[PDB]
Amino acid sequence: LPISIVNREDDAFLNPNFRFIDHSIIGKNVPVADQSFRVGCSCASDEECMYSTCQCLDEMAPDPYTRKKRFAYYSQGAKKGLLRDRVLQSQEPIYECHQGCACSKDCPNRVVERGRTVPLQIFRTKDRGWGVKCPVNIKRGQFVDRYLGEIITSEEADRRRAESTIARRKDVYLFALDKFSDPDSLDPLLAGPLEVDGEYMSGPTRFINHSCDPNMAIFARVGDHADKHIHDLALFAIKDIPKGTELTFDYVNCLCGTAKCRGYLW
Amino acid sequence: ARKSTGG
Numbered sequence: 094l095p096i097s098i099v100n101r102e103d104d105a106f107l108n109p110n111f112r113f114i115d116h117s118i119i120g121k122n123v124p125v126a127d128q129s130f131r132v133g134c135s136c137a138s139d140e141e142c143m144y145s146t147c148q149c150l151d152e153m154a155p156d157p158y159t160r161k162k163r164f165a166y167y168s169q170g171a172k173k174g175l176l177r178d179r180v181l182q183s184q185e186p187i188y189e190c191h192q193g194c195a196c197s198k199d200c201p202n203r204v205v206e207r208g209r210t211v212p213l214q215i216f217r218t219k220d221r222g223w224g225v226k227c228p229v230n231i232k233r234g235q236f237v238d239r240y241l242g243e244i245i246t247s248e249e250a251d252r253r254r255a256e257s258t259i260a261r262r263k264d265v266y267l268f269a270l271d272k273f274s275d276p277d278s279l280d281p282l283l284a285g286p287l288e289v290d291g292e293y294m295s296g297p298t299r300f301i302n303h304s305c306d307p308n309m310a311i312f313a314r315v316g317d318h319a320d321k322h323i324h325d326l327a328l329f330a331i332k333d334i335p336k337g338t339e340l341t342f343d344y345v346n347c348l349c350g351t352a353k354c355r356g357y358l359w
Numbered sequence: 360a361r362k363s364t365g366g
């Protein structure tokens with residue numbers, strides 16, 4: 094689970110100012126609901142958080158109841174712990190457990206929680222700059238890593254978007270946490286639509302290039318259930334991926350080979 | 360621009 098950088102034939106290197114972080118960082122004008130309304134699950138054990146009995150999957154619609162499984166990951170095939178196909182194709186938020194439930198580390202519904210489990214290697218492609226590829230196979234439904242950075246608000250973003258988009262570098266690195274909008278519305282408480290920006294701090298996924306026939310997709314992973322306006326951004330493999338293939342994903346869902354190329358990005 | 364998630 095080490096990050097390695099490789100650049101064949103270019104004189105470029107990572108900006109000494111860029112910094113790698115393990116968890117996202119909230120800016121100061123953003124929301125943190127009281128520890129007074131936090132709820133995890135009492136489940137005992139371990140757990141048995143894979144069945145509807147667990148309060149973590151309430152919003153998750155269905156000798157006487159059933160008493161069937163429902164947690165959005167597979168429980169026992171060679172695909173155990175891989176995103177259910179029902180969730181891949183259907184793109185419904187992933188309701189995961191957290192530090193508020195009577196369940197531990199392996200709780201089957203805490204995949205994104207555990208973080209990345211596959212080693213990644215940033216390598217220098219030739220046209221699109223830096224890109225990412227994995228030194229080991231990744232079956233479809235697999236969790237690669239999540240998109241991090243510094244969480245901010247629509248106004249302060251508007252601030253950077255133009256301050257930047259106008260006089261200098263275009264390289265956009267702002268991801269919008271809008272799965273819910275838107276629703277519631279108103280206022281409540283106180284206060285009566287805030288975003289994540291990782292230009293100067295982030296994870297490997299900060300370097301994945303856009304494609305129009307991606308081999309990866311992003312899903313929202315929710316926890317506390319109050320902490321959902323600032324939901325995690327999970328990058329899941331939507332199809333099996335050989336080693337050495339450059340991870341990709343549609344920035345909304347261009348130099349991409351993709352015959353289906355939507356013209357440009359964003 | 361910015362990265363998003365809608366439908």
Ligand SMILES: Nc1ncnc2c1ncn2[C@@H]1O[C@H](CSCC[C@H](N)C(=O)O)[C@@H](O)[C@H]1O
Nearest residue numbers: 221222223263264265300302303304347348
């Ligand atoms: N499909 C694509 N077409 C054009 N530019 C792309 C692209 N995918 C990524 N980019 C570039 O990457 C930026 C977003 S983040 C991508 C990381 C970049 N490869 C790096 O070396 O830091 C875009 O603004 C654009 O400059």
Ligand SMILES: [Zn+2]
Nearest residue numbers: 142190196200
């Ligand atoms: Zn659990």
Ligand SMILES: [Zn+2]
Nearest residue numbers: 134136142147
């Ligand atoms: Zn539970």
Ligand SMILES: [Zn+2]
Nearest residue numbers: 134149190194
């Ligand atoms: Zn739980």
Ligand SMILES: [Zn+2]
Nearest residue numbers: 305347349354
């Ligand atoms: Zn394209």
